[PDB]
Amino acid sequence: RDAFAALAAPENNSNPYEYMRWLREHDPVHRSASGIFLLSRHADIYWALKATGDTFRGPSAGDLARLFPRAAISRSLNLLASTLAMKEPPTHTRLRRLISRDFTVRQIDSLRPSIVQVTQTRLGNIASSLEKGHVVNLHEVFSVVLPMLIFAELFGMTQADIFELAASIRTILEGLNPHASDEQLAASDAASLEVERYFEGLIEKKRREPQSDLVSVLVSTHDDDDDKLSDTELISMLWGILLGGFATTAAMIDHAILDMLAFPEQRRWLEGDAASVKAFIEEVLRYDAPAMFSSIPRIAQYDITIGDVTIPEGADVRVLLASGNRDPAAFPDPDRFDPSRFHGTAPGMSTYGHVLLSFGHGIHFCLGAQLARVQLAECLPVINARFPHLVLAGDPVREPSAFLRTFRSLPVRLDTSG
Ligand code: HEM
């Protein structure tokens, strides 16, 4: 009845793609009970993403207050509101320019050895148990761990520090849920205080003793421009990067593993050259999303129409990226897992010239898209090579959420013969 509630029901946390098809055909410009709109077709989603900046503005202070009424003047909402995802041009333009100057393709490629090293170490840790015929929850022992250890490497942080930060993130997000208790609010403000204090200390540390990591580069001088992120901007940028990769990459890894196990005839892509591996990962992304529906508010600047449906000035429009990715006008035979769609093409572009929507499009296109892609391209062949007879051990347990599609468990074992 209400698309956001329908998509969060258990069966739709499980397989929402039949309902998404229904929306695309029967209610493509869905108005929820709240008044927020939801676009499900590839064409309309692509349009809305590329119109962000002109036709759609970012959320104002009034918009965030309405979306987070319980936390309207809290430190935690102030921190969220300062992140790149919640900014609009021209402030967004400068902030994105400055982080992209230092968070580069070369910087990300320099993490590839570390991704292999972490994967090798975590897989070694469970090899004995798997060899004895036991079941391992790969989500808990691997998928959620690798992205955090890679953030530690990128930022120049300790493992202990990144795991405490992740715990703070969980607390903060709990405090921004609409049902949040006053106690969760207080815990969120305390965790937000700690996050700021931590990053302040990290910035000061790398400023005195720079290293090769991203924070050291961000806080040091730059030859071409003397523009740079201020300390308050730096805290917000590092925080927003962590939030962006908090649970998304882990869900991606989980989905890739599940696709490897469901379609063992496609494992060959992971055994091939760089172009072959990349194609598998592109199709993993096309096949599932970690949120489904978008988190960034897009506020209509004026009365818009999509078809004969009016979206009034001031309304909030969200997009169902996972539905666009299974739209047959963009991806023929959309329910088939087929990496050849993306073989030899530009990242996120099919052989027919239709774009993958898993990272968005336009000015808010995922800052971490290359980092996510490279993490998957390096770890998945290693997993496939270490445990050639890995199989699914039981049904994955999905993590109940109103906003995200993540797993609590991904149980795996080796195919054993007595
Ligand atoms: C597979 C993993 C990921 C997926 C599927 C994903 C998805 C997305 C999507 C769809 C958006 C745009 C949302 C919109 O336009 O409404 C976005 C934005 C963003 N992502 Fe990711 N993301 C992933 C991983 C990461 C990582 C590893 C980082 C680390 C830098 C990151 C940082 C960000 C940031 C900072 C933004 C805001 C960009 C802006 O507003 O200019 N994400 N992400």
GROMACS .gro file of N, CA and C and ligand atoms in nm, residues 49 84-86 92 96 103 151 240-242 244-245 248-249 252 285 290 294-296 298 319 321 357-361 363-369 371-372 375, ligand 1:
model
  160
   49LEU      N    1   1.856   1.161  -1.109
   49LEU     CA    2   1.994   1.169  -1.064
   49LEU      C    3   2.070   1.276  -1.140
   84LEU      N    4   2.919   1.541   0.266
   84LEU     CA    5   2.906   1.568   0.123
   84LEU      C    6   2.769   1.528   0.067
   85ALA      N    7   2.719   1.412   0.108
   85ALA     CA    8   2.594   1.360   0.054
   85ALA      C    9   2.476   1.454   0.080
   86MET      N   10   2.484   1.535   0.186
   86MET     CA   11   2.375   1.623   0.226
   86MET      C   12   2.397   1.767   0.180
   92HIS      N   13   2.893   2.188  -0.230
   92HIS     CA   14   2.923   2.049  -0.262
   92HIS      C   15   3.035   2.040  -0.364
   96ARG      N   16   3.377   1.838  -0.295
   96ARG     CA   17   3.407   1.721  -0.377
   96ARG      C   18   3.539   1.738  -0.451
  103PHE      N   19   4.204   1.186  -0.282
  103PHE     CA   20   4.146   1.051  -0.283
  103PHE      C   21   4.137   1.012  -0.429
  151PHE      N   22   3.971   0.077   0.539
  151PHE     CA   23   3.960   0.216   0.585
  151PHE      C   24   4.072   0.250   0.683
  240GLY      N   25   3.199   1.124   0.663
  240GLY     CA   26   3.110   1.088   0.554
  240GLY      C   27   3.161   0.973   0.470
  241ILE      N   28   3.294   0.966   0.452
  241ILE     CA   29   3.356   0.854   0.382
  241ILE      C   30   3.331   0.724   0.458
  242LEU      N   31   3.351   0.725   0.590
  242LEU     CA   32   3.325   0.604   0.669
  242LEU      C   33   3.178   0.564   0.664
  244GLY      N   34   2.971   0.627   0.426
  244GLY     CA   35   2.941   0.579   0.292
  244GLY      C   36   2.978   0.434   0.270
  245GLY      N   37   3.089   0.391   0.329
  245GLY     CA   38   3.138   0.256   0.319
  245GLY      C   39   3.104   0.168   0.438
  248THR      N   40   2.774  -0.085   0.317
  248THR     CA   41   2.751  -0.106   0.175
  248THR      C   42   2.849  -0.206   0.116
  249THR      N   43   2.978  -0.184   0.137
  249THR     CA   44   3.078  -0.275   0.083
  249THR      C   45   3.062  -0.416   0.138
  252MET      N   46   2.782  -0.578  -0.045
  252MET     CA   47   2.834  -0.610  -0.178
  252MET      C   48   2.912  -0.740  -0.176
  285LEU      N   49   2.689  -0.595  -0.876
  285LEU     CA   50   2.631  -0.466  -0.843
  285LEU      C   51   2.496  -0.443  -0.912
  290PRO      N   52   2.271  -0.236  -0.165
  290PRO     CA   53   2.268  -0.240  -0.018
  290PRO      C   54   2.159  -0.156   0.047
  294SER      N   55   1.697   0.532  -0.209
  294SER     CA   56   1.805   0.627  -0.188
  294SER      C   57   1.793   0.698  -0.054
  295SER      N   58   1.910   0.734   0.001
  295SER     CA   59   1.916   0.803   0.129
  295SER      C   60   1.926   0.955   0.114
  296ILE      N   61   1.976   1.004   0.002
  296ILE     CA   62   1.993   1.148  -0.015
  296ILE      C   63   1.859   1.211  -0.051
  298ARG      N   64   1.615   1.455  -0.232
  298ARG     CA   65   1.614   1.536  -0.353
  298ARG      C   66   1.483   1.614  -0.350
  319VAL      N   67   1.474   0.730  -0.509
  319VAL     CA   68   1.490   0.646  -0.627
  319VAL      C   69   1.519   0.504  -0.581
  321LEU      N   70   1.715   0.231  -0.687
  321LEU     CA   71   1.825   0.196  -0.776
  321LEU      C   72   1.821   0.049  -0.817
  357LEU      N   73   2.311   0.160  -1.213
  357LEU     CA   74   2.269   0.265  -1.121
  357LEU      C   75   2.313   0.243  -0.977
  358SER      N   76   2.390   0.138  -0.949
  358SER     CA   77   2.421   0.101  -0.812
  358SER      C   78   2.500   0.207  -0.736
  359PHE      N   79   2.573   0.294  -0.806
  359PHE     CA   80   2.649   0.401  -0.744
  359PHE      C   81   2.587   0.538  -0.767
  360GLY      N   82   2.465   0.543  -0.817
  360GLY     CA   83   2.405   0.669  -0.851
  360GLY      C   84   2.456   0.721  -0.983
  361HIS      N   85   2.439   0.852  -1.002
  361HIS     CA   86   2.476   0.918  -1.126
  361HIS      C   87   2.471   1.067  -1.102
  363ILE      N   88   2.598   1.443  -0.981
  363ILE     CA   89   2.695   1.508  -0.892
  363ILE      C   90   2.717   1.430  -0.763
  364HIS      N   91   2.622   1.348  -0.718
  364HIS     CA   92   2.643   1.271  -0.595
  364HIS      C   93   2.689   1.128  -0.622
  365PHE      N   94   2.734   1.098  -0.744
  365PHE     CA   95   2.785   0.965  -0.776
  365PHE      C   96   2.884   0.919  -0.669
  366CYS      N   97   2.869   0.795  -0.624
  366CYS     CA   98   2.944   0.745  -0.509
  366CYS      C   99   3.091   0.784  -0.514
  367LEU      N  100   3.137   0.854  -0.410
  367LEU     CA  101   3.278   0.889  -0.400
  367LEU      C  102   3.366   0.765  -0.390
  368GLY      N  103   3.313   0.659  -0.332
  368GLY     CA  104   3.390   0.538  -0.311
  368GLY      C  105   3.373   0.430  -0.415
  369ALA      N  106   3.319   0.463  -0.533
  369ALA     CA  107   3.287   0.358  -0.630
  369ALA      C  108   3.410   0.277  -0.669
  371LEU      N  109   3.689   0.245  -0.492
  371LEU     CA  110   3.735   0.172  -0.374
  371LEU      C  111   3.653   0.045  -0.352
  372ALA      N  112   3.521   0.053  -0.368
  372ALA     CA  113   3.438  -0.066  -0.356
  372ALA      C  114   3.470  -0.167  -0.465
  375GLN      N  115   3.814  -0.336  -0.396
  375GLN     CA  116   3.807  -0.432  -0.286
  375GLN      C  117   3.747  -0.564  -0.333
  419HEM     C1  118   2.935  -0.116  -0.300
  419HEM     C2  119   2.955  -0.024  -0.207
  419HEM     C3  120   2.883   0.109  -0.220
  419HEM     C4  121   2.766   0.136  -0.278
  419HEM     C5  122   2.666   0.041  -0.346
  419HEM     C6  123   2.746   0.277  -0.264
  419HEM     C7  124   2.638   0.346  -0.310
  419HEM     C8  125   2.631   0.483  -0.314
  419HEM     C9  126   2.529   0.558  -0.382
  419HEM    C10  127   2.413   0.494  -0.460
  419HEM    C11  128   2.552   0.689  -0.365
  419HEM    C12  129   2.471   0.806  -0.423
  419HEM    C13  130   2.339   0.816  -0.349
  419HEM    C14  131   2.245   0.912  -0.417
  419HEM     O1  132   2.282   0.974  -0.522
  419HEM     O2  133   2.131   0.922  -0.363
  419HEM    C15  134   2.671   0.701  -0.285
  419HEM    C16  135   2.728   0.818  -0.245
  419HEM    C17  136   2.842   0.827  -0.168
  419HEM     N1  137   2.924   0.722  -0.130
  419HEM    FE1  138   2.897   0.527  -0.175
  419HEM     N2  139   2.855   0.333  -0.200
  419HEM    C18  140   2.941   0.230  -0.171
  419HEM    C19  141   3.061   0.236  -0.107
  419HEM    C20  142   3.122   0.351  -0.067
  419HEM    C21  143   3.256   0.363  -0.015
  419HEM    C22  144   3.357   0.247  -0.004
  419HEM    C23  145   3.276   0.494   0.011
  419HEM    C24  146   3.406   0.557   0.065
  419HEM    C25  147   3.447   0.675   0.016
  419HEM    C26  148   3.155   0.567  -0.018
  419HEM    C27  149   3.133   0.703   0.000
  419HEM    C28  150   3.027   0.774  -0.055
  419HEM    C29  151   3.008   0.916  -0.046
  419HEM    C30  152   3.102   1.010   0.031
  419HEM    C31  153   2.897   0.950  -0.112
  419HEM    C32  154   2.842   1.094  -0.129
  419HEM    C33  155   2.895   1.153  -0.261
  419HEM    C34  156   2.838   1.291  -0.287
  419HEM     O3  157   2.730   1.324  -0.233
  419HEM     O4  158   2.900   1.367  -0.365
  419HEM     N3  159   3.062   0.476  -0.066
  419HEM     N4  160   2.718   0.574  -0.255
   0.00000   0.00000   0.00000
